[PDB]
Amino acid sequence: NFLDQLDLIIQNKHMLEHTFYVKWSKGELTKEQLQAYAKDYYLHIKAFPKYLSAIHSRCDDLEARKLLLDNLMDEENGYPNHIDLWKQFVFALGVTPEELEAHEPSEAAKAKVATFMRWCTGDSLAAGVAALYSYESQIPRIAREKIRGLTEYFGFSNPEDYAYFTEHEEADVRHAREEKALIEMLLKDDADKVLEASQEVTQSLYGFLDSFL
Amino acid sequence: NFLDQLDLIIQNKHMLEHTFYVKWSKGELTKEQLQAYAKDYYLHIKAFPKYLSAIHSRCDDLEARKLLLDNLMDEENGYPNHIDLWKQFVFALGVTPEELEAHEPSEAAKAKVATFMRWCTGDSLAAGVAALYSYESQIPRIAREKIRGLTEYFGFSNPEDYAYFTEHEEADVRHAREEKALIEMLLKDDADKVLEASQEVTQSLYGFLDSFLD
Ligand SMILES: [Fe+3]
Ligand SMILES: [Fe+3]
Ligand SMILES: [Fe+3]
Ligand SMILES: [Fe+3]
């Protein structure tokens, strides 16, 4: 039951039903909105590995830490890592490296990131993972929608320009599954806390997308 | 200068000069003291990866996080990992798995671990790494001293029984160097904090070894 409630919260407040992606899917965003979005996502992208180490650092379940480590490796080890790939996507949108490093994250991005961190630094490890799950579980569907739109409306005829999304179509299937497993492995009579994180994260993500309209 | 001061603190309060290792090196510990020590280290061994993620999770320097990740991977990814290898050592001492899982960490072990964590969860990332450096920088020398003693006085004729130490002879050479680099990369006018962590950790380690001469 609680896993299902969790997934339902997400489905009922999924990012592909936000006006920003409804527009995306009909090709109704300007290049500027696209470049703004990409730049403003960068704070979250850089933070993501910290969301994971934050939970790892509070966790004494050895098997859970291994799984958290597996995710953290996928995000951050090697070259190109997920941050690198995101930077490529931004560059392929015509934003320069300098412009990317100079962008001041919007208040809406700072609030989204702080929402994630608040849960990953809190007393419930399971709720920490649910916060992350509530985002990662959406990315497989979003990534392939984003590819469809980049291709059909924004002229991305070269697949290496959307490598981040090609990566995430697949990678996050794995991460969602292992986060689900982590939630039941770490649960300690805090299923309510898991549910609350999901409500709070999904809303935050809506607050974030609101800011480009 | 401050890196030298750091290393001097460690040298002047190094674990091999604690009475517990002076005894070790002359073969003057009982098997019981040896099994006790090994069991009581386990809390720290399991905590170690958390020390590293704790700093990682507070760090926005991308290059520093990669290095922290590198250390974390070495400690905890794969099989056998460092925790697995330590379990093997304990088992090779004649302690059973059940006995290992049943050991209540001593108050001295809990204090050592809390000292490390306090620094790794604090406001200075550089001081966090220095806390870990103040331990890991000692392990190459200790590991080979421990091997020598296991071999010469405790009958370890089969090298797989001290794989943890064989691992650490080498691994921690790398980790010490990269922690050194991390400390200068993360420094923010908190060289004083770096020095204070080392004083505090070295002492805590002394407090921990003291507890087996009771
Ligand atoms: Fe990713
Ligand atoms: Fe992911
Ligand atoms: Fe190790
Ligand atoms: Fe190490």
Tab-separated table of C-alpha atoms and ligand atoms in Angstrom:
chain	number	residue	atom	x	y	z
A	1	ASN	CA	0.000	0.000	0.000
A	2	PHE	CA	2.427	2.790	1.003
A	3	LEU	CA	4.635	2.243	-2.109
A	4	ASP	CA	1.529	2.569	-4.194
A	5	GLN	CA	0.391	5.697	-2.442
A	6	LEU	CA	3.900	7.024	-3.075
A	7	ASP	CA	3.741	6.340	-6.768
A	8	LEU	CA	0.273	7.831	-6.935
A	9	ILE	CA	1.351	11.066	-5.361
A	10	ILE	CA	3.958	11.335	-8.077
A	11	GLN	CA	1.644	10.400	-10.947
A	12	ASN	CA	-0.893	12.936	-9.769
A	13	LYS	CA	1.708	15.691	-9.670
A	14	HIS	CA	4.065	14.644	-12.413
A	15	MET	CA	6.292	17.112	-14.168
A	16	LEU	CA	5.044	16.175	-17.664
A	17	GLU	CA	1.639	17.505	-16.771
A	18	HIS	CA	3.030	20.900	-15.729
A	19	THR	CA	2.208	23.659	-18.202
A	20	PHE	CA	5.917	23.982	-18.924
A	21	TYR	CA	6.086	20.447	-20.408
A	22	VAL	CA	2.644	20.592	-21.985
A	23	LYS	CA	4.207	23.518	-23.903
A	24	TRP	CA	7.415	21.568	-24.403
A	25	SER	CA	5.563	18.695	-26.014
A	26	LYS	CA	3.733	20.954	-28.520
A	27	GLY	CA	6.976	22.810	-29.319
A	28	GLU	CA	5.713	26.032	-27.680
A	29	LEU	CA	8.825	27.136	-25.739
A	30	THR	CA	11.282	29.731	-26.968
A	31	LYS	CA	14.913	29.023	-27.140
A	32	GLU	CA	15.319	31.561	-24.273
A	33	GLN	CA	12.998	29.646	-21.967
A	34	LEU	CA	14.938	26.514	-22.872
A	35	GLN	CA	18.326	28.114	-22.097
A	36	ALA	CA	16.968	29.624	-18.867
A	37	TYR	CA	15.613	26.295	-17.698
A	38	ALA	CA	18.858	24.514	-18.484
A	39	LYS	CA	21.003	27.042	-16.641
A	40	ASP	CA	18.726	27.129	-13.648
A	41	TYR	CA	18.747	23.297	-13.312
A	42	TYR	CA	22.495	23.317	-12.780
A	43	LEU	CA	22.383	23.926	-9.048
A	44	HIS	CA	20.265	20.793	-8.567
A	45	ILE	CA	22.392	18.768	-10.906
A	46	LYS	CA	25.534	19.678	-8.925
A	47	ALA	CA	23.777	19.077	-5.630
A	48	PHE	CA	22.375	15.716	-6.537
A	49	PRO	CA	25.458	13.698	-5.476
A	50	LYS	CA	25.350	15.520	-2.141
A	51	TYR	CA	21.701	14.402	-1.630
A	52	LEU	CA	23.033	10.804	-1.802
A	53	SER	CA	26.120	11.202	0.398
A	54	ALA	CA	23.964	13.051	2.876
A	55	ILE	CA	21.849	9.888	3.396
A	56	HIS	CA	24.860	7.582	3.161
A	57	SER	CA	26.561	9.559	5.936
A	58	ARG	CA	23.553	9.026	8.285
A	59	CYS	CA	23.055	5.379	7.553
A	60	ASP	CA	24.415	2.364	9.489
A	61	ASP	CA	22.734	-0.237	7.265
A	62	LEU	CA	25.705	-1.578	5.356
A	63	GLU	CA	23.670	-3.092	2.530
A	64	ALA	CA	21.778	0.182	2.064
A	65	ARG	CA	25.025	2.159	1.931
A	66	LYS	CA	26.270	-0.089	-0.866
A	67	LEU	CA	23.181	0.693	-2.860
A	68	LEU	CA	23.506	4.420	-2.124
A	69	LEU	CA	27.154	4.173	-3.213
A	70	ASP	CA	26.149	2.442	-6.465
A	71	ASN	CA	23.874	5.423	-7.279
A	72	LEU	CA	26.485	7.931	-6.252
A	73	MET	CA	29.100	6.307	-8.491
A	74	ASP	CA	26.773	6.362	-11.482
A	75	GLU	CA	26.144	10.106	-10.932
A	76	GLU	CA	29.622	11.331	-10.257
A	77	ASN	CA	32.460	8.851	-11.049
A	78	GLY	CA	34.226	8.741	-14.322
A	79	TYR	CA	34.274	11.109	-17.234
A	80	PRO	CA	31.909	12.223	-18.517
A	81	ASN	CA	29.779	12.087	-15.380
A	82	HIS	CA	26.174	13.279	-15.145
A	83	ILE	CA	27.256	16.838	-14.348
A	84	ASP	CA	29.588	16.824	-17.348
A	85	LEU	CA	26.766	15.542	-19.536
A	86	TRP	CA	24.438	18.238	-18.332
A	87	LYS	CA	27.055	20.870	-19.067
A	88	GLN	CA	27.239	19.490	-22.593
A	89	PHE	CA	23.512	19.835	-23.018
A	90	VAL	CA	23.623	23.426	-21.852
A	91	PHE	CA	26.519	24.136	-24.272
A	92	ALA	CA	24.608	22.517	-27.104
A	93	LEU	CA	21.783	24.975	-26.406
A	94	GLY	CA	24.144	27.857	-27.271
A	95	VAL	CA	24.896	28.917	-23.675
A	96	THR	CA	28.651	29.462	-23.168
A	97	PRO	CA	30.649	27.970	-20.319
A	98	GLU	CA	31.222	31.408	-18.904
A	99	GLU	CA	27.528	32.263	-18.955
A	100	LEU	CA	26.840	28.919	-17.241
A	101	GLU	CA	29.317	29.627	-14.399
A	102	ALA	CA	27.974	33.199	-14.021
A	103	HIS	CA	24.245	32.251	-13.752
A	104	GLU	CA	22.876	33.024	-10.287
A	105	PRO	CA	20.490	30.210	-9.410
A	106	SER	CA	16.913	31.541	-9.142
A	107	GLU	CA	15.151	31.660	-5.740
A	108	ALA	CA	12.871	28.865	-7.067
A	109	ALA	CA	15.905	26.606	-7.774
A	110	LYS	CA	17.419	27.403	-4.376
A	111	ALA	CA	14.105	26.390	-2.749
A	112	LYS	CA	13.848	23.148	-4.739
A	113	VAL	CA	17.369	22.148	-3.774
A	114	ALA	CA	16.792	23.074	-0.112
A	115	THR	CA	13.677	20.908	-0.121
A	116	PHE	CA	15.674	17.908	-1.260
A	117	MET	CA	18.433	18.620	1.265
A	118	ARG	CA	16.102	19.121	4.109
A	119	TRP	CA	14.774	15.574	3.607
A	120	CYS	CA	18.171	13.985	2.954
A	121	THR	CA	19.616	15.612	6.122
A	122	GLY	CA	16.506	14.804	8.274
A	123	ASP	CA	15.688	12.056	10.798
A	124	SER	CA	14.106	9.676	8.302
A	125	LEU	CA	16.504	7.928	5.906
A	126	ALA	CA	13.559	6.349	4.122
A	127	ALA	CA	11.921	9.705	3.602
A	128	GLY	CA	15.307	11.022	2.368
A	129	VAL	CA	15.295	8.393	-0.375
A	130	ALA	CA	11.614	8.995	-1.129
A	131	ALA	CA	12.455	12.610	-1.752
A	132	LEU	CA	14.998	11.534	-4.342
A	133	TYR	CA	12.698	8.791	-5.676
A	134	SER	CA	9.967	11.343	-6.183
A	135	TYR	CA	12.242	13.004	-8.763
A	136	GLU	CA	14.284	10.151	-10.212
A	137	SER	CA	11.184	8.009	-10.739
A	138	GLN	CA	9.943	10.646	-13.192
A	139	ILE	CA	13.121	11.065	-15.246
A	140	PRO	CA	12.907	8.004	-17.570
A	141	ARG	CA	9.605	9.347	-18.994
A	142	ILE	CA	10.736	12.973	-19.012
A	143	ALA	CA	14.064	12.217	-20.621
A	144	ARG	CA	12.467	10.566	-23.612
A	145	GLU	CA	9.924	13.351	-23.938
A	146	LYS	CA	12.703	15.863	-23.816
A	147	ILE	CA	14.570	13.981	-26.572
A	148	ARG	CA	11.428	13.871	-28.706
A	149	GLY	CA	11.020	17.644	-28.362
A	150	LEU	CA	14.679	18.538	-28.823
A	151	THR	CA	14.595	16.507	-31.985
A	152	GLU	CA	11.270	17.617	-33.455
A	153	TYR	CA	11.289	21.315	-32.452
A	154	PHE	CA	14.761	22.520	-31.465
A	155	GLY	CA	16.840	21.018	-34.235
A	156	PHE	CA	18.962	18.513	-32.318
A	157	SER	CA	19.862	16.251	-35.264
A	158	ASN	CA	23.064	15.053	-33.521
A	159	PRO	CA	22.368	12.559	-30.648
A	160	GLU	CA	25.542	13.438	-28.708
A	161	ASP	CA	23.991	16.878	-27.952
A	162	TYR	CA	21.367	15.124	-25.755
A	163	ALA	CA	23.639	12.453	-24.228
A	164	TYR	CA	22.457	13.400	-20.681
A	165	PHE	CA	18.975	12.335	-21.606
A	166	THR	CA	20.040	9.277	-23.521
A	167	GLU	CA	21.905	8.328	-20.319
A	168	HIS	CA	18.963	8.993	-18.032
A	169	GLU	CA	16.352	7.086	-20.123
A	170	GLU	CA	18.168	3.963	-18.795
A	171	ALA	CA	20.173	4.939	-15.746
A	172	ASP	CA	17.279	6.194	-13.733
A	173	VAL	CA	15.232	3.035	-14.345
A	174	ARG	CA	17.903	1.343	-12.232
A	175	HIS	CA	18.046	4.144	-9.707
A	176	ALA	CA	14.281	4.217	-9.209
A	177	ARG	CA	14.145	0.536	-8.576
A	178	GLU	CA	17.006	0.680	-6.050
A	179	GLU	CA	15.537	3.699	-4.308
A	180	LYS	CA	12.236	1.774	-3.937
A	181	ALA	CA	14.211	-1.071	-2.360
A	182	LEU	CA	16.049	1.392	-0.116
A	183	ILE	CA	12.784	2.875	1.118
A	184	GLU	CA	11.542	-0.530	2.353
A	185	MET	CA	14.943	-1.490	3.649
A	186	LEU	CA	15.304	1.735	5.686
A	187	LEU	CA	11.685	2.158	6.778
A	188	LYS	CA	11.161	2.539	10.543
A	189	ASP	CA	7.464	3.193	11.046
A	190	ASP	CA	7.814	6.428	9.078
A	191	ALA	CA	5.739	5.642	5.991
A	192	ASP	CA	3.880	8.904	6.758
A	193	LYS	CA	7.203	10.729	6.435
A	194	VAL	CA	7.836	9.082	3.073
A	195	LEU	CA	4.480	10.222	1.860
A	196	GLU	CA	4.987	13.780	3.108
A	197	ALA	CA	8.370	14.057	1.331
A	198	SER	CA	6.818	13.059	-1.927
A	199	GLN	CA	4.080	15.629	-1.567
A	200	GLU	CA	6.599	18.240	-0.672
A	201	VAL	CA	9.108	17.417	-3.443
A	202	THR	CA	6.475	17.122	-6.222
A	203	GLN	CA	5.158	20.542	-5.217
A	204	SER	CA	8.603	22.054	-5.142
A	205	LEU	CA	9.243	20.764	-8.610
A	206	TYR	CA	6.015	22.420	-9.715
A	207	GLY	CA	7.150	25.642	-8.032
A	208	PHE	CA	10.399	25.366	-10.006
A	209	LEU	CA	8.758	24.953	-13.399
A	210	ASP	CA	6.243	27.693	-12.582
A	211	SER	CA	9.154	30.117	-12.624
A	212	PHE	CA	9.755	29.927	-16.392
A	213	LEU	CA	6.154	30.909	-17.380
B	1	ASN	CA	54.398	25.435	7.079
B	2	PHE	CA	50.888	24.331	8.200
B	3	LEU	CA	51.178	20.930	6.472
B	4	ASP	CA	54.431	20.402	8.221
B	5	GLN	CA	52.924	21.378	11.582
B	6	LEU	CA	50.140	18.913	10.795
B	7	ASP	CA	52.544	16.108	10.145
B	8	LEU	CA	54.541	16.994	13.255
B	9	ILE	CA	51.488	16.754	15.452
B	10	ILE	CA	50.928	13.284	14.155
B	11	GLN	CA	54.541	12.241	14.519
B	12	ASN	CA	54.600	13.481	18.067
B	13	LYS	CA	51.491	11.559	18.982
B	14	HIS	CA	51.726	8.559	16.720
B	15	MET	CA	50.023	5.321	17.543
B	16	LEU	CA	53.181	3.189	17.289
B	17	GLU	CA	54.597	5.006	20.265
B	18	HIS	CA	51.588	4.228	22.436
B	19	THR	CA	52.313	1.624	25.090
B	20	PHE	CA	49.855	-0.691	23.343
B	21	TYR	CA	52.087	-0.896	20.211
B	22	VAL	CA	55.363	-0.806	22.084
B	23	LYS	CA	53.975	-4.023	23.640
B	24	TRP	CA	52.782	-5.219	20.258
B	25	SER	CA	56.213	-4.851	18.760
B	26	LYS	CA	57.893	-6.875	21.512
B	27	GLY	CA	55.165	-9.563	21.300
B	28	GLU	CA	53.826	-8.695	24.780
B	29	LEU	CA	50.053	-8.709	24.164
B	30	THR	CA	47.786	-11.611	24.966
B	31	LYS	CA	45.571	-13.152	22.384
B	32	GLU	CA	42.639	-11.757	24.474
B	33	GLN	CA	43.903	-8.167	24.226
B	34	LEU	CA	44.334	-8.771	20.494
B	35	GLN	CA	40.781	-10.082	20.016
B	36	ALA	CA	39.400	-7.243	22.165
B	37	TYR	CA	41.153	-4.601	20.165
B	38	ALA	CA	39.992	-6.093	16.858
B	39	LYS	CA	36.354	-6.290	17.949
B	40	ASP	CA	36.383	-2.791	19.398
B	41	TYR	CA	37.811	-1.273	16.165
B	42	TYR	CA	34.835	-2.497	14.192
B	43	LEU	CA	32.643	0.471	14.950
B	44	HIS	CA	35.213	2.835	13.460
B	45	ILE	CA	35.822	0.583	10.471
B	46	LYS	CA	32.104	0.578	9.678
B	47	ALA	CA	31.883	4.326	10.325
B	48	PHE	CA	34.817	5.250	8.162
B	49	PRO	CA	32.829	5.483	4.835
B	50	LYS	CA	30.427	7.799	6.614
B	51	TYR	CA	33.231	10.094	7.591
B	52	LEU	CA	33.952	10.528	3.839
B	53	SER	CA	30.340	10.932	2.656
B	54	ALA	CA	29.772	13.382	5.462
B	55	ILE	CA	32.401	15.721	3.964
B	56	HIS	CA	31.327	14.969	0.435
B	57	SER	CA	27.764	15.945	1.308
B	58	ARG	CA	28.888	19.378	2.549
B	59	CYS	CA	31.259	20.188	-0.319
B	60	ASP	CA	30.531	22.174	-3.496
B	61	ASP	CA	34.066	21.866	-4.896
B	62	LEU	CA	33.480	19.362	-7.679
B	63	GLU	CA	37.105	18.305	-8.004
B	64	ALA	CA	37.330	17.739	-4.231
B	65	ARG	CA	34.201	15.591	-4.300
B	66	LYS	CA	35.744	13.385	-7.009
B	67	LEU	CA	38.734	12.750	-4.797
B	68	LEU	CA	36.515	12.087	-1.789
B	69	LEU	CA	34.531	9.687	-3.973
B	70	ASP	CA	37.736	7.952	-5.047
B	71	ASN	CA	38.572	7.280	-1.364
B	72	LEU	CA	35.036	6.197	-0.600
B	73	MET	CA	35.043	3.692	-3.476
B	74	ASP	CA	38.282	2.113	-2.330
B	75	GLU	CA	36.876	1.707	1.166
B	76	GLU	CA	33.456	0.397	0.408
B	77	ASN	CA	32.850	-0.688	-3.244
B	78	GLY	CA	33.374	-4.217	-4.439
B	79	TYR	CA	33.901	-7.426	-2.606
B	80	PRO	CA	35.811	-7.831	-0.447
B	81	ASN	CA	35.755	-4.246	0.736
B	82	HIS	CA	37.716	-2.872	3.660
B	83	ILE	CA	34.968	-3.778	6.119
B	84	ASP	CA	34.881	-7.324	4.722
B	85	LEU	CA	38.663	-7.538	5.047
B	86	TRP	CA	38.532	-6.418	8.655
B	87	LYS	CA	35.908	-9.000	9.403
B	88	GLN	CA	38.267	-11.608	7.976
B	89	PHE	CA	41.031	-10.456	10.253
B	90	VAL	CA	38.799	-10.681	13.276
B	91	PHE	CA	37.699	-14.148	12.207
B	92	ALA	CA	41.317	-15.178	11.716
B	93	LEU	CA	41.956	-14.203	15.346
B	94	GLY	CA	39.434	-16.867	16.543
B	95	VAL	CA	36.473	-14.537	17.188
B	96	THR	CA	33.265	-15.925	15.728
B	97	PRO	CA	30.905	-13.919	13.504
B	98	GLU	CA	28.262	-14.040	16.145
B	99	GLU	CA	30.634	-12.738	18.808
B	100	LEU	CA	31.628	-9.958	16.418
B	101	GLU	CA	28.019	-8.868	15.821
B	102	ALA	CA	27.290	-9.078	19.572
B	103	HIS	CA	30.215	-6.922	20.769
B	104	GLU	CA	29.037	-3.673	22.307
B	105	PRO	CA	31.519	-1.003	21.252
B	106	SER	CA	33.395	0.360	24.309
B	107	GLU	CA	32.776	3.954	25.486
B	108	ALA	CA	36.342	4.700	24.294
B	109	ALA	CA	35.473	3.493	20.750
B	110	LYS	CA	32.238	5.462	20.732
B	111	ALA	CA	34.220	8.626	21.737
B	112	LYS	CA	36.841	8.087	19.021
B	113	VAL	CA	34.204	7.687	16.363
B	114	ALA	CA	32.280	10.721	17.645
B	115	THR	CA	35.444	12.814	17.512
B	116	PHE	CA	35.938	11.931	13.834
B	117	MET	CA	32.304	12.606	13.048
B	118	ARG	CA	32.254	15.847	14.856
B	119	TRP	CA	34.999	17.115	12.546
B	120	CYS	CA	33.547	15.605	9.390
B	121	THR	CA	30.118	17.189	10.159
B	122	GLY	CA	31.600	20.562	11.158
B	123	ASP	CA	31.992	23.914	9.400
B	124	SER	CA	35.504	23.282	8.146
B	125	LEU	CA	35.822	20.786	5.276
B	126	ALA	CA	39.594	21.039	5.432
B	127	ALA	CA	39.617	20.271	9.134
B	128	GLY	CA	37.280	17.332	8.332
B	129	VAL	CA	39.878	15.829	6.001
B	130	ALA	CA	42.679	16.554	8.431
B	131	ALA	CA	40.837	14.563	11.033
B	132	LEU	CA	40.819	11.601	8.654
B	133	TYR	CA	44.373	12.354	7.499
B	134	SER	CA	45.548	12.270	11.079
B	135	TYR	CA	44.511	8.629	11.156
B	136	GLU	CA	45.050	7.383	7.614
B	137	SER	CA	48.515	8.976	7.403
B	138	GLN	CA	49.555	6.597	10.209
B	139	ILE	CA	48.215	3.410	8.727
B	140	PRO	CA	50.947	2.493	6.183
B	141	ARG	CA	53.532	2.281	8.998
B	142	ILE	CA	51.122	0.620	11.432
B	143	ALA	CA	49.889	-1.973	8.976
B	144	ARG	CA	53.401	-3.263	8.294
B	145	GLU	CA	54.185	-3.274	12.003
B	146	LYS	CA	51.019	-5.186	12.612
B	147	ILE	CA	51.978	-7.703	9.938
B	148	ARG	CA	55.421	-8.158	11.417
B	149	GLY	CA	53.923	-8.872	14.851
B	150	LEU	CA	51.126	-11.122	13.610
B	151	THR	CA	53.765	-13.099	11.784
B	152	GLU	CA	56.485	-13.230	14.421
B	153	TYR	CA	54.369	-13.600	17.586
B	154	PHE	CA	50.789	-14.656	16.805
B	155	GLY	CA	51.413	-17.431	14.287
B	156	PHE	CA	49.896	-15.909	11.125
B	157	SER	CA	51.826	-18.049	8.588
B	158	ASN	CA	49.077	-17.594	5.943
B	159	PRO	CA	49.085	-14.097	4.334
B	160	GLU	CA	45.344	-14.077	3.514
B	161	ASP	CA	44.651	-13.869	7.287
B	162	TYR	CA	46.112	-10.344	7.256
B	163	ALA	CA	44.775	-9.153	3.882
B	164	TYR	CA	43.332	-5.985	5.507
B	165	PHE	CA	46.834	-4.933	6.422
B	166	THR	CA	48.400	-5.993	3.178
B	167	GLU	CA	45.729	-3.823	1.520
B	168	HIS	CA	46.355	-0.848	3.762
B	169	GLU	CA	50.199	-0.875	3.449
B	170	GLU	CA	49.484	0.448	-0.095
B	171	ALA	CA	46.019	1.870	-0.243
B	172	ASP	CA	46.498	4.434	2.493
B	173	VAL	CA	49.679	5.752	0.885
B	174	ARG	CA	47.319	6.941	-1.859
B	175	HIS	CA	44.692	8.125	0.551
B	176	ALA	CA	47.093	10.145	2.648
B	177	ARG	CA	48.469	11.945	-0.385
B	178	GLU	CA	44.979	12.766	-1.678
B	179	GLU	CA	43.786	13.920	1.718
B	180	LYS	CA	46.820	16.227	1.875
B	181	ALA	CA	45.785	17.628	-1.490
B	182	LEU	CA	42.179	17.928	-0.319
B	183	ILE	CA	43.257	19.921	2.754
B	184	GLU	CA	44.977	22.566	0.611
B	185	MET	CA	42.233	22.547	-1.965
B	186	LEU	CA	39.467	23.041	0.663
B	187	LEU	CA	41.338	25.426	2.986
B	188	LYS	CA	39.562	28.697	3.760
B	189	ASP	CA	41.667	30.484	6.346
B	190	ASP	CA	41.083	27.655	8.786
B	191	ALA	CA	44.593	26.214	9.103
B	192	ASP	CA	44.146	26.629	12.869
B	193	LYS	CA	41.106	24.290	12.645
B	194	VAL	CA	43.176	21.794	10.702
B	195	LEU	CA	45.758	21.777	13.441
B	196	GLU	CA	43.170	21.552	16.223
B	197	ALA	CA	41.552	18.479	14.562
B	198	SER	CA	44.813	16.671	14.379
B	199	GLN	CA	45.515	17.385	18.072
B	200	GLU	CA	42.075	16.193	18.932
B	201	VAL	CA	42.094	13.050	16.785
B	202	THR	CA	45.608	11.927	17.831
B	203	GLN	CA	44.607	12.241	21.432
B	204	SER	CA	41.365	10.375	20.887
B	205	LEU	CA	43.299	7.529	19.328
B	206	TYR	CA	45.512	7.486	22.419
B	207	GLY	CA	42.388	7.413	24.558
B	208	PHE	CA	41.203	4.411	22.510
B	209	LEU	CA	44.411	2.383	22.899
B	210	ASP	CA	44.655	3.284	26.589
B	211	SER	CA	41.516	1.188	27.056
B	212	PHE	CA	43.192	-2.148	26.377
B	213	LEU	CA	45.862	-1.738	29.131
B	214	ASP	CA	43.093	-1.376	31.839
C	1	FE	FE	21.875	11.286	-12.969
C	2	FE	FE	20.033	9.115	-11.397
C	3	FE	FE	40.547	1.292	4.189
C	4	FE	FE	41.944	4.257	3.462
